[PDB]
Amino acid sequence: MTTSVFVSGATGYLAQQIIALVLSKGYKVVGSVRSEEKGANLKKLYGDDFSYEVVKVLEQKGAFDEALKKHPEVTIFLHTASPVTFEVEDTEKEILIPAINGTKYVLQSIKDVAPQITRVVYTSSVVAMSVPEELGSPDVVLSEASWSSLSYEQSKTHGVLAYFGSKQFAERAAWEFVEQEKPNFALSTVNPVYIFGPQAKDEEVKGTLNHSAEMVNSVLKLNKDDDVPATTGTFIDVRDVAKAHLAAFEKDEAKGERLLLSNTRFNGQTLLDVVRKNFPQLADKLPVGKPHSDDFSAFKEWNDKKTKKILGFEYFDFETSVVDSIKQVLKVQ
């Protein structure tokens, strides 16, 4: 018989790509959603091998118990749902607690009611490994060993810092659970940088603007006199992140590992240069800046050697990820 994979936050951008990939390899999927209609929409998109359960609040003890009890066929759990909204009334209630408590409660639910689950993957982030000023530093070398120094108290102050904290603390909690609770499953994490690339379904393009994907896609909203975007950092293609999740549960080597998913540096000029060459009909409708003035040669390469060895595949290049993302938006209008 077939294996079932559980995916929390099935509505999301990364989660959908993960689902499409997992389905392609012959797994069944069970997705968590915050509403019935949200589930129903996904079901129409993904078909018969996809099912959903409604889990409205992560941060309640036993939130996943019923859903797990309903799906004894599931032997893999991918916990991807997390807050990603930076502008909030209460950083704790809206960012920190759902990530941290929600993560702690999922793991406990799996141990309580899903002993059959062999593998759990937590979707972390580079923000778990760092602080904001570090990410942009040519002198900083991140690795799978890196942990953020941000305090919980500091993390509270505003939404961005809260997200950084939410990831670091939830991930630490996940590792702590494994140590303390001695579950049946092995844990692994995936720690991505900014995620670019096309959405899993064309139908989902119009609906919400994922904060990372929109960093690429927003270029289409520029006009000829606008400034070059100041957006900058490191990227990873969504399809690569999804493949990493697959590796994260499939490979023996992945057990107990953190995977740093990071490719190349970019800025707004890099982005503009790609789009203008690829979509030359847009050239007259976009700024030019200073083509190929971007220089990243000073930046020390991050140490992802272990992750790359474990994964064993090559990443999508920046132009490809960008072009694929734009082609989709154009197709849909």
Ligand SMILES: NC(=O)c1ccc[n+]([C@@H]2O[C@H](COP(=O)([O-])OP(=O)(O)OC[C@H]3O[C@@H](n4cnc5c(N)ncnc54)[C@H](OP(=O)(O)O)[C@@H]3O)[C@@H](O)[C@H]2O)c1
């Ligand atoms: N994509 C990136 O650039 C990036 C970078 C670093 C790390 N990550 C990690 O990858 C995951 C996906 O990120 P994303 O960019 O795809 O964000 P996203 O598109 O907004 O996905 C977040 C999903 O999780 C659910 N969710 C959000 N906040 C929640 C809360 N407080 N309680 C319960 N459910 C909640 C939402 O479900 P509904 O649709 O039902 O609201 C949403 O579909 C994140 O958890 C993040 O930790 C992503």
